[PDB]
């Protein structure tokens, strides 16, 4: 809205990373103090620094807050193993008659190497045919990272309806697994000759097909 933030910022583990926050002349440039918060994906945000002059208890001294007139800046020294969150600007807005937050910056560069994926295609069982639906599942497991595109074909034309893709989650041995469903009906399931799922990972494309008859 009234506060704009960059989408992402790049840095190195050992140099200085500085973020710039720009607003208006009635919320931050009027004279109001600014507050910075960290939005960890899964935990409630906490207070980092208020007023850019005092240090709250439990907060390290590596975080520095300054207000260069209409713009506020935050600087850090060294990238540790907990900076994988979002930084926001909080200031009182007279026009909005309340507190308004910023956009949010993501702090990550690269932590995902490559691996070799493996897929499995399982046709629906006999009890699924009488439910007036056909859920075609093509599971993908043991791959890294979790960025796989899913394409469905019926050996004559690609299927662009009912295609879904779930987000992958970390396995026990630091890998990723995913599944893809396809909503169909048993009326046309038997008419088609075969069904398959096609995926591509870093140029490696594998294909598995099943025959209902």
């Amino acid at each position: 809205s009234v506060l704009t933030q960059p989408p992402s910022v790049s840095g190195a583990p050992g140099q200085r990373v500085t973020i710039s926050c720009t607003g208006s002349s009635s919320n931050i440039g009027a004279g109001y103090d600014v507050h910075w918060y960290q939005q960890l994906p899964g935990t409630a945000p906490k207070l980092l620094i208020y007023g850019n002059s005092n240090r709250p208890s439990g907060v390290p001294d590596r975080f520095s807050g300054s207000k260069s007139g209409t713009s506020a800046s935050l600087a850090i020294t060294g990238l540790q193993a907990e900076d994988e969150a979002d930084y926001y600007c909080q200031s009182y807005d007279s026009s909005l008659s309340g507190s308004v937050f910023g956009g949010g910056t993501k702090l990550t560069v690269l932590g995902q190497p490559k691996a070799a994926p493996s897929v499995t295609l399982f046709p629906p069982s006999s009890e699924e045919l009488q439910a007036n639906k056909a859920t075609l599942v093509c599971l993908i497991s043991d791959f890294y990272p979790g960025a796989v595109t899913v394409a469905w074909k019926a050996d004559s034309s690609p299927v662009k309806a009912g295609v879904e893709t779930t987000t992958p989650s970390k396995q026990s041995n630091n890998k990723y697994a995913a599944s893809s469903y396809l909503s169909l009906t048993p009326e046309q399931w038997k008419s088609h000759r075969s069904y398959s799922c096609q995926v591509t990972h870093e140029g490696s494309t594998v294909e598995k097909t099943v025959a209902p008859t």
Partner: protein, 50 residues
């Protein structure tokens, strides 16, 4: 001290203006500031709008 008949040019006539107008525009622009007073609700005295 003796002037004969004829035409004679003595000085020059200059019409000095008495008033000056220097107004360049007809009106100047404005900025949105009436919303400070024309508002649905106001703030309090411990935390007022700046």
């Amino acid at each position: 001290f003796t002037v004969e008949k004829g035409i004679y040019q003595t000085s020059n006539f200059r019409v000095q203006p008495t008033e000056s107008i220097v107004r360049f525009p007809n009106i100047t622009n404005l900025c949105p500031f009436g919303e400070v007073f024309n508002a649905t609700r106001f703030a309090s005295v411990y935390a007022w709008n700046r």
